[PDB]
A paper describes a structure:
Here we report crystal structures of assembled HIV-1 CA hexamers with peptides comprising the linear binding epitopes of NUP153 and CPSF6 and the two antiviral compounds PF74 and BI-2. To attempt to explain how these diverse phenotypes are achieved, we carried out interaction studies using a CA that can be assembled into stable hexamers through the formation of engineered disulfide bonds at the NTD-NTD intrahexameric interface. The complete binding site is formed by NTD helices 3 and 4 of one CA monomer (referred to as the ‘first site’) and NTD helices 2 and 7 and CTD helices 8 and 9 from an adjacent monomer (referred to as the ‘second site’).
To understand how CPSF6 and NUP153 interact with hexameric CA we determined X-ray crystal structures with the same peptide ligands used in the ITC studies. Crystals of each complex were obtained in two different spacegroups, hexagonal (P6) and orthorhombic (P212121), similar to those reported for the uncomplexed CA hexamer. Comparison to CPSF6 and NUP153 complexes solved in the same orthorhombic form reveals that these cofactors selectively bind to one of these conformations, which we have termed ‘open’. Binding of CPSF6 and NUP153 to hexamer in the ‘closed’ conformation is prevented by steric clashes with loop. There was no observed interaction between NUP153 and CA N74, supporting findings that mutation N74D specifically abolishes CPSF6 binding. NUP153 interacts with helix 2 residues P34, I37, P38 and S41 and helix 7 residues I135, L136, N139, K140, V142 and R143. NUP153 also interacts with the end of helix 8, where it meets helices 2 and 7, and hydrogen bonds with R173, Q176 and A177. Interactions between NUP153 and the second monomer are essential, as shown by the ITC experiments in which NUP153 binds hexamer but not monomer.
Numbering used by the authors:
A (entry chain O), F (entry chain M), I (entry chain P): 1410 to 1418
B (entry chain A): 1 to 5, 9 to 219
C (entry chain F): 1 to 5, 9 to 87, 93 to 219
D (entry chain E): 1 to 5, 9 to 84, 97 to 175, 188 to 219
E (entry chain D): 1 to 5, 9 to 177, 184 to 219
G (entry chain C): 1 to 5, 9 to 177, 183 to 219
H (entry chain B): 1 to 5, 9 to 87, 97 to 219
C-alpha cells in the first residue's frame, strides 16, 4: 500500500 | 454531518455537494483531491460519505476499485472483531459490523447512535479512513509520469523542473525512506549539466532552498 | 424541509432550488442525478419534493412517466392500507404524493409520535420512477461498449462501468457481463498484456498494466 | 418573510431577489416559472410579494394583466367579506406592521398566502397566453423519434387520447394495438 | 441595518453592497431600480443609506440632483418641526433635525437611538422616503422615449408593442392611458380592438390580436 | 425492475 | 470585527477580504473606493484594518504614503495625550498610544478590551479615521484631470458633460464657485439657455432645459 | 477553527478552502499572499492549517521547502522544551496529535495556542519562499525615459516588499537609492526639496 | 532571515 499524499501530517 | 449548536445531525449542504463534484471533474485524481475530500467530509456520517461518492458521475473505473477496497477493509474489520455470543452484563450496545460502518446495512439512527455514544465509536471517521486508503491507490495509478522519467530540459528553469519532480513524487506515494533516497541522488542526477555542476559545489546535506537559490 | 434548531419546518432555499435545476439541465438523466436528488431533498416534505419536480422545465416525456409511476405506487399503498376512537387518520396514496394534502397535514404526520415519514415514503416512489427513466435514457448497451484502436484503456473501462451503471441490471448479470465481456472487447495490444498476467487479476492490476 | 428562530419578520435576501429576476429573464413565462415563484416567495408578506413583482424589468404587458387579475380578486374579496380589505391584502393600502399583525395573529389571517394565490392565478393566465403552439397542432413527423414527439406534446399540454391520434401512421397502429390501459412507458418502448 | 435576533444593529453585508452597485451599473436608472433599492435597504439606518449612495461610481449628475432633493426635504422638515431649545430630559433624546435624518450631522449611536426608542422615530424610513422621492425625479428625466411616440409597427407583434408601451409609461409615471393604447395600434389590430367595445380587459385585447 | 444506481450504501 | 449575538469578536470573512481586494484592483483609487472601505470595515479592529491594507498587492506607492500619514496622526495623538507615569487602576487598562491604535504595538486582546470597555475607547473607529484621511490625499493625487479643463464638447449631451464635471470635482476635493463654473464651461448653445433661467436655478431645471 | 457562539470547534468552510486555493493559483507567491493566509486561517487548529497547505496542488518545490522549515522549527521547539502532556514539536505541527488534543491545548486555562505557534512557523517559511520567488532586485529598479514617477515608485516599493530586508537596510535604500535611480529631470527637482522630504511631497513635485 | 511582508501592523 502507498504512504499518502498528505505532505503535512 | 454531526456538529455542535450538544451534538446534532445536519443535512449535507448544497455548497459542500457542489464543491466535491467540481473538484473531481476539474482535478480528476490529482494528489490535492484527497485533502479536499477529507475537509469537505468534516464530521460526516457513513450516509454522507456514500452520498458524496455516489454523486460522482464519471471515473466509474476508479469508483469500482474504491468499492473493492471498502469491501476488503470491511471484511478485515469483521475478522478482527468477532461476534460475541455469551455475556451481556450492562448490557453493552451492539457492535458495528464492517457493512454497518460502510453504511450498507445500517440506518442513519444507528450511525448517529454510535458516533454520539459515550464512549463514542466514530464509524464516520473509520469509514473515511477506508475511503482515503482506496483513493490513494487510485491517485497512484492516475499519476501520468514516473519519477525516473522526470528530467530537466536544456533551457528549462530549475524552479519549474522541481515543481514537476515533487508533484510526481507526491502522486506515486512511495515510502519515506524511498522518497529521501530518490530526493538525495535522483534530483541532482536528472538536472541539466549547467545546474548539476553548481548543485554539487554546495556539497552533501544541502537544503532544497540552497539548491534552488544557486540555479537562478 | 423539516430540521432541528425540536423538529421545525423551513422554507426550501434558493441554493437548493437552483442546484437541482442546474443538475437536470447539465446531466440530463445520467445515473449520478439520482443521488444528487436524494441529497438535495434531505428531510424534504411532499410539497418540497413536488416543488423540485415541478421546477424542471424540459424532459416532459420523462416527467410524465414519473407521474404514472407515482400513481401506481399510490394505488398500491391504498391496496395494502384499507380505510378503516381518538386516533389520527392515516394518509392515503394521494396524501403522501402531496396532491390531496396540505402542508400542515404533511408536517403533522412527519413530526408525530410515532412518526409517519410521508416525505421519505414519497421520495422512495420518486427514486423508483427515476431509475426506470435512467434505464430508458441509457444511450448505448453493454454489448456495444468496445475499446477503440488508439483509445486509452482507462477511457474504455470508464465507458463500460458508466454504461453498466445506467443499465441497472442485477448483480449476478453485472458480474456475468464484467467477467466475460470486459476483457473480450478490449483491443489486441492491451488484451495481449492482460492475458500474460493470468486469471484472477483485480481491476487495479489490469488498468495499471495497460498504461 | 416571516420565519421561526416565535414567528419573526426578516428582510428579503439578495439571493432570493436575484434568483427571481434571473428566472423571469431566462425562462420568460414557461410553466416551471410558477412553482419557482411559489418556492422563492415562501412565507412572504404582501410587501415582499410586491417587491418581487416590481423588480421585474421587462414583460410589462404581462405585469399589467397581473394587476387587473389582482384587482378582480380584491374586488371579489370585498363582496364576499381590524378586518383586512382587498387592497390591504394586495399591500397597496397597508403597512408592514399591519401585515405582520394579521399573519402572526391568533387566530392568524394569512394575507401573504391569500395574496400569493391571486398572483399565481394571474400568472397561470399569462403562461396559457404565452404558449406558442396549440395542443392540436402538435403532430409527429414522418421520421421523428417518438421520445421527441412526446416531449413536445406534454410541454405544450402543460401550458394549455390526442397523443395516439396525432402520431405517425406506423407508430399509431402499434399504440392502438396495445389498446387503452397501456402506460406511456409501454407506448414509448413500442415505438423506440 | 437594524434587525431582530430585541432590535440590534448589524453591519451592511458585502452581498447587499455588491448587489446595489451592480444594479446601478447594469440597469442605469430604469424604473425597476427603485424597488430594488427599497428591498436592499430593508431596515437600513441613515448611515447605511448614505453608504449605498456614496458607493455608486458613475452617474454623478444624477447623484448631485439627489443631494438637492434631500436638502429640500431636509429644509422642509426643519420648517414643519421647529427647534426645541433648552436642556433635554433624562431618558430622552434630542429631536432630529433634517440633517440628522439625512445622516450628515448625526452619529450611528443617535440613529440607532431614535429607531429603537419607545415611541420610535424611524429616521431610516423617513430618509428613505426622501431618497425614493428624489430617485423618481431622476427616473422621469432619464426616460429616452415619450409615451406619445410609442406606436405599433407595420408588422410588429401586439405583445411586443404593449411591452414597450407600459415600459415607457412606467418611467414617465404621469381612461386616457387605455384609449391611447388602442388608438396608437396599427389599422389591423385597431379594427379588432374596437369590436370588443368599452370596458374591455387587457387580456381580451391581447388575445384578439394574437 | 432496475436495481438502482447507488453504488455505495 | 466586533459584533453582537454582548459584544464579541469574529474573524474577518472570506467575502469581506475578497470584496476589498477586487474593489482596489478594479476601481484603483476612484472616490467611491473610500465609502466601500468604510462599509467593508464596519466594526473592524485595528488588526482587521491592517489585514485589509496588507492584502492589497499593487499600488505600493500609495500604500507607502498611507503609512506616512498614519505615523503623522499617531505622533499627533501622542502629543495631545501625554503618558501617565503611574500604575493602572483596578477594572481598567492602559491608555492607548498612537502605535497601539494603529495595531503595531498592541495585541488583539487589548484592542477588544478598549472597544468593549465601559466607557468604550473606539480604537478601530479612530484608526479608520486616520486611514480615510490618508486615502483622501491619495485620491486627490491620483485624480487625472483638473476641474478647469472639464469643458462641454461641440455636440455632447449635457448629461454626459455634467457627469464628467461632478466626477472630476468629487476626486479633486475628495459652493457658488462650482455652480458658476458649470455654466461658464458649457457650450455657447446651452449656455444661452442656462442664463435665461436666471440665478438660483436647480440642476434638475438646468438639465431639463438642455435636452 | 475555534470560535465563540464558550469556545467551540467548527469545520473549515468551503468558502475558506476555495478562497485559499484561488489566491495561490492566481497570485503564486506575491507578498500579499501571506496576509491573506493569516486572515483565512483565523482561529485555525493545526489540522486546519495542514488542510489548507495540503489542498495546494502546484508549487510543490515551495511546499517541500515549507515542509523543511516546519521541521527545523519543530526541532527547535523540542530543544527549548525538554521532556520531564506538554506539546512537542510534532504535536504543534499536527503530525502526531489528534484534533481532541489540539482543541484541548487551545481551550485550556492557561491556554497553549498551538494553532498560533504553528502559524508562526508557516509564515516564517512562507516569507523565505516569497523572498526567493521575487523576480527583480531593488538595484535594477530604475525610472524609465518617459515613465511617470508614480509608476516608478510603484515598482520600487513592490520589489522592496518582496526581498524583505531589515528596516535599517530598507531606510538606507529608501533614502539614497530612490532619488539616485530616478531620471535626470525629476532627480533635479527632488534634490531641490532637500533632506527629510515626505513621499507625498516628492510625488507631487514630479507630476 | 526575512523581516516580513506585513507593512502595516
Ligand atoms: Cl398516455
Amino acid at each position: 500500500s502507498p504512504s499518502g499524499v498528505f505532505t503535512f501530517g | 454531518p454531526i456538529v455542535q449548536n450538544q451534538m446534532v445531525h445536519q443535512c449535507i449542504s448544497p455548497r459542500t455537494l457542489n464543491a466535491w463534484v467540481k473538484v473531481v471533474e476539474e482535478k480528476a485524481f490529482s494528489p490535492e483531491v484527497i485533502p479536499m475530500f477529507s475537509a469537505l467530509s468534516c464530521g460526516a456520517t457513513p450516509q454522507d460519505l456514500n452520498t458524496m461518492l455516489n454523486t460522482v458521475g464519471g471515473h466509474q473505473a476508479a469508483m469500482q476499485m474504491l468499492k473493492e477496497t471498502i469491501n476488503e477493509e470491511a471484511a478485515e474489520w469483521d475478522r478482527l472483531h468477532p461476534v460475541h455470543a455469551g455475556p451481556i452484563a450492562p448490557g453493552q450496545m451492539r457492535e458495528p459490523r464492517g457493512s454497518d460502518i460502510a453504511g450498507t446495512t445500517s440506518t442513519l439512527q444507528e450511525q448517529i447512535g454510535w458516533m454520539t455514544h459515550n464512549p463514542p465509536i466514530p464509524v464516520g471517521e473509520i469509514y473515511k479512513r477506508w475511503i482515503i486508503l482506496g483513493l490513494n491507490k487510485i491517485v497512484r495509478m492516475y499519476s501520468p509520469t514516473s519519477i525516473l522519467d522526470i528530467r530537466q530540459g536544456p533551457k528549462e528553469p530549475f524552479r519549474d523542473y522541481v515543481d514537476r519532480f515533487y508533484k510526481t513524487l507526491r502522486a506515486e506515494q512511495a515510502s519515506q525512506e524511498v522518497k529521501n533516497a530518490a530526493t538525495e541522488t535522483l534530483l541532482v542526477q536528472n538536472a541539466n549539466p549547467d545546474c548539476k555542476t553548481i548543485l554539487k559545489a554546495l556539497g552533501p546535506g544541502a537544503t532544497l532552498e540552497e539548491m534552488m537559490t544557486a540555479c537562478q
